[PDB]
Design a protein around this nucleic acid. Structure first.
Ligand SMILES: [Cl-]
Ligand SMILES: [Cl-]
Ligand SMILES: [K+]
Ligand SMILES: [Mg+2]
Ligand SMILES: [Mg+2]
Ligand SMILES: [Mg+2]
Ligand SMILES: [Mg+2]
Ligand SMILES: [Mg+2]
Ligand SMILES: [Mg+2]
Ligand SMILES: [Mg+2]
Ligand SMILES: [Mg+2]
Ligand SMILES: [Mg+2]
Ligand SMILES: [Mg+2]
Ligand SMILES: [Mg+2]
Ligand SMILES: [Mg+2]
Ligand SMILES: [Mg+2]
Ligand SMILES: [Mg+2]
Ligand SMILES: [Mg+2]
Ligand SMILES: [Mg+2]
Ligand SMILES: [Mg+2]
Ligand SMILES: [Mg+2]
Ligand SMILES: [Mg+2]
Ligand SMILES: [Mg+2]
Ligand SMILES: [Mg+2]
Ligand SMILES: [Mg+2]
Ligand SMILES: [Mg+2]
Ligand SMILES: [Mg+2]
Ligand SMILES: [Mg+2]
Ligand code: NA
Ligand code: NA
Ligand code: NA
Ligand code: NA
Ligand code: NA
Ligand code: NA
Ligand code: NA
Ligand code: NA
Ligand code: NA
Ligand code: NA
Ligand code: NA
Ligand code: NA
Ligand code: NA
Ligand code: NA
Ligand code: NA
Ligand code: NA
Ligand code: NA
Ligand code: NA
Ligand SMILES: [Sr+2]
Ligand SMILES: [Sr+2]
Ligand SMILES: [Sr+2]
Ligand SMILES: [Sr+2]
Ligand SMILES: [Sr+2]
Ligand SMILES: [Sr+2]
Ligand SMILES: [Sr+2]
Ligand SMILES: [Sr+2]
Ligand SMILES: [Sr+2]
Ligand SMILES: [Sr+2]
Ligand SMILES: [Sr+2]
Ligand SMILES: [Sr+2]
Ligand SMILES: [Sr+2]
Ligand SMILES: [Sr+2]
Ligand SMILES: [Sr+2]
Ligand SMILES: [Sr+2]
Ligand SMILES: [Sr+2]
Ligand SMILES: [Sr+2]
Ligand SMILES: [Sr+2]
Ligand SMILES: [Sr+2]
Ligand SMILES: [Sr+2]
Ligand SMILES: [Sr+2]
Ligand SMILES: [Sr+2]
Ligand SMILES: [Sr+2]
Ligand SMILES: [Sr+2]
Ligand SMILES: [Sr+2]
Ligand SMILES: [Sr+2]
Ligand SMILES: [Sr+2]
Ligand SMILES: [Sr+2]
Ligand SMILES: [Sr+2]
Ligand SMILES: [Sr+2]
Ligand SMILES: [Sr+2]
Ligand SMILES: [Sr+2]
Ligand SMILES: [Sr+2]
Ligand SMILES: [Sr+2]
Ligand SMILES: [Sr+2]
Ligand SMILES: [Sr+2]
Lengths: 132, 337, 53
RNA sequence: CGUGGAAGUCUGUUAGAGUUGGUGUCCUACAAUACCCUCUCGUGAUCUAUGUGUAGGGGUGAAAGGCCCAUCGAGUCCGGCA
RNA sequence: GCGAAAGCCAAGGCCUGUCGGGAGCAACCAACGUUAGGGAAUUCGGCAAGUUAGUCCCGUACCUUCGGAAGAAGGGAUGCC
RNA sequence: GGUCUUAAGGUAGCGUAGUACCUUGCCGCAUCAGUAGCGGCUUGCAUGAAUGGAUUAACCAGAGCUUCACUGUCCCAACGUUGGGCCCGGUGAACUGUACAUUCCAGUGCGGAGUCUGGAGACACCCAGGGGGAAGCAAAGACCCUAUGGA
RNA sequence: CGAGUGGCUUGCUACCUCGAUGUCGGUUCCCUCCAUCCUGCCCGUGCAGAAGCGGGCAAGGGUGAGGUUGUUCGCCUAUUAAAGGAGGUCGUUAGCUGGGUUUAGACCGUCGUGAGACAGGUCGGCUGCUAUCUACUGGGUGUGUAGGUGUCUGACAAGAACGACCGUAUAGUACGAGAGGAACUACGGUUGGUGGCCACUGGUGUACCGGUUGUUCGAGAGAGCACGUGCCGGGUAGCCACGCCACACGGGGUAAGAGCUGAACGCAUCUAAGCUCGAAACCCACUUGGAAAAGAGACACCGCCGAGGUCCCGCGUACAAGACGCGGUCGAUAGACUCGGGGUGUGCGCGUCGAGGUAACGAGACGUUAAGCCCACGAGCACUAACAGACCAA
């Protein structure tokens, strides 16, 4: 994919439960897979800020629950490194549900978003309120 | 059916034994192109700091912007090309033919060598030129030594001697170039060979770690779960199958780790200066203060502080040289903390 | 930049920036400042802090 | 509401008894059954000391062919016996 | 302190749960302490480790042989002067 | 089948069971995905009434399943602590030992060889190590058969 | 229907082994095979493109994570370039595991008059040893080549040291009515693997500084014990990964394949002789080891009464012994001291305040105090200690 513009230490794995930072009706997501990733024997597939991931809805509205959807990682607790050397970390781990074309399923995004994610997924960015 | 998985560690850096010479020995040199010149230099590792640079990469989205880059400070004072050795081409490969020495020797070169008292530079030279007329001249290299005495942070005064190839135009032009350098006294500097912004291959003997087990030495796993509580934690599964009935040298086993020669490729030289600009507050931990000829190498360099490291024009660069990077800032903040 | 906690100048190419839940931002010069903040201590109440002194 | 203080009653490394798991330590042992942590019981069909009784096709057995002096689907010793 | 509990200390006893000396003392093993982010993905199996915890107040479901379930759960409090 | 063996011919209940071979039975729940678990169905290879059936509050170091919380079980390992380990003084065993023995790759051989054959490799000795091989050591198997053996 | 190859399944035999060679599956770690799943290069197509489908060369590298089940297998889920298969005593318990199998206890169904049984199900249920040899990973001592110092050579040896993907420009272009929709090439990044490094981020840090519970030393001060820190907070050096750096381009020869020239056979023919090209594969390039390479190496200088070396002493860029490296007054090698640079967080004492309380007393607050305490780092500095001195050597 297009270079992120920052070095990331993946803070998530297959099975991690994260926040769904949007208004789709899904409150909690479970990471199932990481797009374009291939690990190694015994290694838990890892995902981090900027990665597109296949996800499962653990908490939310009845219609949304149990649905297997795609999403983009917007925030993570494990630090990332920006070109000037500063590390950047968030209060939580969050992803935004996205469709086949990478357009957010929801109308509004909840909480801040990393600028690096904003540049990679333009439509996800346009829906953002705060881009840090 | 049992998942695949690459083996533990590379078999290309073996055997994993203690290095014979603490002073690195390049096993290859650059190609012969433009003006003749010494194909290497050397210095002493001091420590690290960071630097803020302006992006040079024309294909980078960040071209022209501030970028923080890690830097290893290496004290690179002037060395002495004390002799010119010539190799002749024989059916058994290259072999030393003769050497042309000088008169001016550093005050403490006698701590390592038996300095010449009676030598004939003209007979050696004559022999060399005659070998060239015959077309048997293999290649030309300079016996070089460092001046540890010029580096206060380094305890030794006993110079470190290494041979550095001279490459360049035609053999005649570089034979003459070599002799000129040597005759003076052999004094040359990092500036004479390298330009800030170029790529160098750095060689050095790694930090010693004595004996270490398979986990640290080869990167094998530790026993997992219940297998970690029975009496085996950091020991591998088995030394091999029933047959062949012998242990193959390829199985990850315990032994000397560290203190091996390594040659790291494509190390961009960020800045070649002199003085105390890169030095750190309180002094480089376990080293001392820098205030003299230095070289800022991008990233890490093999070996501990005080060890002799060697430079060589990159033999296999991936990128084109983007000379003299703009250094906006050089961290001097204490390394303690 | 100054550390939003202690007040000293953050050495360029150093430190971390914490992004709060409400989108706010806190530039920390070091782990020490972060740790003291996590304990609920206010910079002005710590004598060693530039803010305090 | 109080009083009362029952219980093969609860908690409990009180004394005391026992031993689920670690398949930990040990495994030419400290030890021919040990060590540590965890764990169970602890007013009763409880635990415990000494004395006393039951003897080998016989005892004893809330029964596992368990136990009857490191040995028991028939003890040990000597003899039958080379 | 509820206590014949822990922990600390007397009286009393001991340095004999009887080989020592040396190396910042490596690998490896036995017992342990601390580990970012993820949080059972490990394993036949949460095995191992951990989480909880004392006391007071509030509050407490299904089911029930009406005894019990029950310290259910869940919530709050706790020092010193 | 719409009686016959041999007396009767399975009632209440329970049921894919610690009993169901077929079997991962079918439907559903739960999970991203559940040979598991639970609910229902059930003709039960081969349930069933003190050979006790069903059911059950309470109890349990009894078997299985799920959830919340938690964590180095794991991703993937790191650093540290104490005792060993290593070196030195002293003390000082045992196991094991047909012989020879620096082996390796193939082959051959009672078909699973350090010792035979052909090659390859191989200067001697010593320290530390984890244990591939010596079909390593420890026991005239813990499986099977045999004996005009035993209990 | 016919002919074969393998030795992965099963069966057959009874040749080896029962004074005992530890079953299945998994795990860990190493090597290999090719009948190739991906990746490279090709051919055909019911090949427009994109994508398929089938076939060829090719074993360099890769082939992963999860849900039921002990499972191997298989079914299932989401990822993927692809998530190939097989051999090594169905590799791998003097490595691990005990979940399957297969002792002694027990239950169920079925069978049996019964004791008991089952190629059925089920709960519980034991794994010893200090390595002699050989093997290999690393470390030494000697001999040989045959006075010393320094520098090299390179026979051989090891490597995957690099594999793969996504994205952008090419380009909404070629192609196609449209729908759809490429490539060469140049760039940016990711992933797996590899080697090294600590400025940055993170972990540790039983150095250290602080807070604080119980108890003991009468209080205060300052301490011991509460496991190798009582507990909690911070954390230097160092070590680390979750952090950071680096890991080609190009040659040469080929396979499959595409062709040239070309005859046997006047023609034709990529082939018979010759030749131009052409794979991630082969060789070189790159990294690592390597004078014990018995043809036992090369060069320069020093020395044979003295070059060099040893013991010794101060130490670490080194280290389990040994080895290695540096300094020894022609000196900054280690320590003391003083600065610098760091860690903690404001010392003892005294003064003011302080809810109150006749008072005694008083938790605590402020000031003195950017305090006090401490430092495995640096600098300065010969103050102390590297002294004295013994010896080998052509
Ligand atoms: Cl393991
Ligand atoms: Cl996945
Ligand atoms: K047998
Ligand atoms: Mg696995
Ligand atoms: Mg540091
Ligand atoms: Mg800091
Ligand atoms: Mg009695
Ligand atoms: Mg963690
Ligand atoms: Mg698994
Ligand atoms: Mg537990
Ligand atoms: Mg059922
Ligand atoms: Mg009846
Ligand atoms: Mg027998
Ligand atoms: Mg027998
Ligand atoms: Mg038997
Ligand atoms: Mg018979
Ligand atoms: Mg009989
Ligand atoms: Mg036979
Ligand atoms: Mg055997
Ligand atoms: Mg083939
Ligand atoms: Mg291969
Ligand atoms: Mg096997
Ligand atoms: Mg074995
Ligand atoms: Mg064993
Ligand atoms: Mg053993
Ligand atoms: Mg079982
Ligand atoms: Mg019985
Ligand atoms: Mg069992
Ligand atoms: Na053990
Ligand atoms: Na075996
Ligand atoms: Na009453
Ligand atoms: Na026990
Ligand atoms: Na008897
Ligand atoms: Na004694
Ligand atoms: Na019946
Ligand atoms: Na009981
Ligand atoms: Na741990
Ligand atoms: Na062995
Ligand atoms: Na055949
Ligand atoms: Na096995
Ligand atoms: Na291949
Ligand atoms: Na499975
Ligand atoms: Na076997
Ligand atoms: Na075993
Ligand atoms: Na096994
Ligand atoms: Na080629
Ligand atoms: Sr295997
Ligand atoms: Sr060299
Ligand atoms: Sr070489
Ligand atoms: Sr064990
Ligand atoms: Sr064999
Ligand atoms: Sr009781
Ligand atoms: Sr009790
Ligand atoms: Sr057990
Ligand atoms: Sr334990
Ligand atoms: Sr013990
Ligand atoms: Sr035992
Ligand atoms: Sr009582
Ligand atoms: Sr007896
Ligand atoms: Sr007799
Ligand atoms: Sr006393
Ligand atoms: Sr004694
Ligand atoms: Sr700590
Ligand atoms: Sr689990
Ligand atoms: Sr699981
Ligand atoms: Sr509570
Ligand atoms: Sr009926
Ligand atoms: Sr032979
Ligand atoms: Sr051993
Ligand atoms: Sr082939
Ligand atoms: Sr292909
Ligand atoms: Sr099988
Ligand atoms: Sr099956
Ligand atoms: Sr078992
Ligand atoms: Sr079965
Ligand atoms: Sr059975
Ligand atoms: Sr000889
Ligand atoms: Sr494109
Ligand atoms: Sr279109
Ligand atoms: Sr203590
Ligand atoms: Sr506590
Ligand atoms: Sr051809
Ligand atoms: Sr030699």
């Amino acid at each position: 994919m297009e270079a992120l513009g920052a070095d990331v230490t993946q803070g998530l794995e297959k099975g991690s439960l994260i926040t769904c930072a949007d208004n789709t009706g899904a409150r909690e997501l479970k990471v199932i897979s990481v797009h374009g990733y291939s690990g190694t024997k015994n290694r838990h597939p890892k995902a981090g800020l900027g990665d597109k991931i296949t996800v499962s809805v653990t908490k939310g509205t009845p219609e949304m629950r149990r649905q297997v959807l795609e999403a983009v990682v917007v925030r993570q607790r494990k630090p990332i490194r920006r070109p000037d050397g500063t590390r950047v970390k968030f209060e939580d781990n969050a992803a935004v549900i996205v469709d086949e074309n990478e357009d957010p399923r929801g109308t509004e995004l909840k909480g801040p978003i990393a600028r690096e994610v904003a540049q990679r997924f333009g439509s996800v960015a346009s829906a953002a309120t705060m881009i840090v | 059916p049992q998942p695949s998985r690459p083996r533990k560690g590379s078999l290309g850096f073996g055997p994993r034994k203690r290095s014979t010479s603490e002073t690195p020995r390049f096993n290859s040199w650059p190609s012969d192109d433009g003006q003749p010149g010494v194909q290497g230099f050397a210095g002493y590792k001091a420590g690290m700091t960071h630097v803020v640079l302006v992006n040079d990469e024309p294909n980078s989205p960040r071209e022209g912007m501030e970028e923080t880059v890690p830097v290893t400070v290496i004290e690179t004072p002037p060395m002495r090309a004390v002799a010119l050795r010539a190799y002749e081409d024989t059916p058994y490969g290259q072999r030393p033919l003769t050497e042309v020495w000088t008169d001016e020797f550093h005050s403490e070169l006698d701590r390592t060598l038996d300095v010449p008292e009676d030598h004939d530079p003209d007979a050696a030279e004559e022999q060399i030129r005659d070998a060239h007329e015959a077309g048997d001249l293999g290649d030309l290299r300079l016996i070089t030594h460092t001046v540890p005495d010029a580096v206060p942070s380094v305890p030794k005064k006993k110079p470190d001697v290494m041979e550095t190839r001279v490459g360049g135009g035609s053999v005649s032009d570089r034979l003459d170039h070599a002799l000129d350098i040597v005759e003076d006294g052999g004094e040359h500097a990092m500036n004479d060979i390298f330009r800030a912004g170029e790529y160098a291959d750095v060689a050095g003997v790694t930090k010693g770690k004595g004996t270490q087990g398979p986990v640290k030495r080869w990167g094998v796993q530790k026993r997992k779960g219940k297998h970690a509580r029975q009496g085996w934690r950091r020991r591998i599964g088995n030394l091999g199958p029933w047959n062949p009935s012998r242990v193959r040298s390829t199985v990850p086993q315990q032994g000397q780790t560290g203190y091996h020669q390594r040659t790291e490729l494509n190390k961009r030289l960020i800045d070649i200066g002199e003085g105390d600009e890169p030095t750190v507050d309180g002094g480089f931990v376990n080293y001392g203060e820098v205030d003299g000829p230095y070289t800022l190498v991008k990233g890490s360099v093999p070996g501990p502080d005080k060890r002799l490291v060697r430079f060589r024009p990159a033999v296999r660069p991936n990128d084109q040289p983007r000379l003299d990077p703009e250094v906006r800032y050089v961290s001097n903040e204490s390394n303690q903390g | 930049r100054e550390c939003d906690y202690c007040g000293t100048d953050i050495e360029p190419g150093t430190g971390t920036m914490f992004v709060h839940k409400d989108g706010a931002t806190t530039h920390f010069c070091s782990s020490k400042c972060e740790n003291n903040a996590d304990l609920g201590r206010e910079a002005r109440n710590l004598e060693w802090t530039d803010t305090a002194r």
